[PDB]
Amino acid sequence: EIVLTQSPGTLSLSPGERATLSCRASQSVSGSYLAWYQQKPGQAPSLLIYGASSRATGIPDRFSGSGSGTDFTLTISRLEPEDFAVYYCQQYVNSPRTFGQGTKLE
Amino acid sequence: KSWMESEFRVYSSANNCTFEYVSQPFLMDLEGKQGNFKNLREFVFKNIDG
Amino acid sequence: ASVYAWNRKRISNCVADYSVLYNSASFSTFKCYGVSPTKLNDLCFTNVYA
Ligand SMILES: *[C@@H]1O[C@H](CO)[C@@H](O)[C@H](O)[C@H]1NC(C)=O
Ligand SMILES: *[C@@H]1O[C@H](CO)[C@@H](O)[C@H](O)[C@H]1NC(C)=O
Numbered sequence: 356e357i358v359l360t361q362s363p364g365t366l367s368l369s370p371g372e373r374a375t376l377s378c379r380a381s382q383s384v385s386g387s388y389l390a391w392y393q394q395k396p397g398q399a400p401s402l403l404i405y406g407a408s409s410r411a412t413g414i415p416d417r418f419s420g421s422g423s424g425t426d427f428t429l430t431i432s433r434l435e436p437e438d439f440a441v442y443y444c445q446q447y448v449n450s451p452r453t454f455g456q457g458t459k460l461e
Numbered sequence: 462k463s464w465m466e467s468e469f470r471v472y473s474s475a476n477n478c479t480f481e482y483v484s485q486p487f488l489m490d491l492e493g494k495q496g497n498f499k500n501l502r503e504f505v506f507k508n509i510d511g
Numbered sequence: 512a513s514v515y516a517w518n519r520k521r522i523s524n525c526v527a528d529y530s531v532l533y534n535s536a537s538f539s540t541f542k543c544y545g546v547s548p549t550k551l552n553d554l555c556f557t558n559v560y561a
Contacts, residue, residue, distance in 0.1 A: 383539070424539035479558065482524060 357382050359444050359455040362427075367439070367459045376429040376458045378422075378444040388447035389426040391418075394457075395440040403442070404429065464491035522559035529553035 362377040378389070387407035392400035393414075402411050408420035421428035429442060444455040512518035529552045533541040546552050 383536075480523070481521065 357384075357446055357448060357450045357453065359446060359453065361444060361455045361458040363458050364456075365460070369439075370434060372434060374429070374431045374434070376442055377427040378455055379425045379427055380446060380448075382449070383424045384422075384426045384446055385448045387422070387426060389422065390445050390447075391420070391429050392443040392445065393438070393440045394443060400443060464493070466491065520561045522561055527553075527556070527559070 357380050359378050359380050362379065363375070366376075367374065376391075389407065390405050391403040393403050394400040401414075403414055403418055404411060404420045406420075407422045407426055410416050410418065417432040419428075419430045419432060420426075421430060426446075431438065439459065441457040441460040443457055445452060532538065533548060541548055543552065
């Protein structure tokens with residue numbers, strides 16, 4: 356079982372700057388089987404990225420992945436107030452599609 | 462008294478190149494003896510099916 | 512070497528331990544194209560360019 360640990364648990368602190376959200380795994384993520392998710396408070400998560408860096412429909416390319424091996428990046432190029440939301444990771448390598456613990460939770 | 466190779470005038474330059482093989486270094490006589498011939502080296506070179 | 516001055520070495524006339532590029536798996540990528548990591552890897556190669 357491949358556990359995922361998001362490293363910046365509360366780095367955001369109502370951020371006004373570009374971010375470097377991270378995820379790390381016990382066994383290296385094989386073939387970029389990772390995704391990111393946008394869980395706006397009081398609402399369901401919305402897919403943000405798939406593969407390593409492949410973007411999503413209706414999500415601006417300002418959201419940028421930058422991972423390989425231990426896939427670890429979600430980079431907000433220009434930060435907007437509405438996009439604030441706990442961001443989750445999920446790996447499709449071996450694991451029963453397990454998730455991380457969330458990086459942008461108040 | 463020492464016979465050593467000094468000049469090698471064969472080729473100028475090469476851009477592409479596919480096969481290189483160099484044997485292990487050794488020593489050779491290179492001196493010119495006087496008398497009758499004493500060695501015969503026989504070779505056969507063939508090229509078939511690549 | 513630096514990327515612009517890519518260094519090439521020719522691996523010629525030696526058997527190869529094709530069981531040498533993922534068992535360490537230090538390498539993030541052992542992504543093979545066409546040959547794949549398989550017995551075909553551990554097979555005859557005309558020339559090997561590194
Ligand atoms: C001795 O012979 C070598 C050839 O093997 C030559 O290079 C060298 O110059 C010679 N020594 C002198 C003092 O000329
Ligand atoms: C070397 O190989 C390339 C590859 O096709 C070829 O274009 C070129 O003419 C060859 N010769 C030289 C001298 O570069």
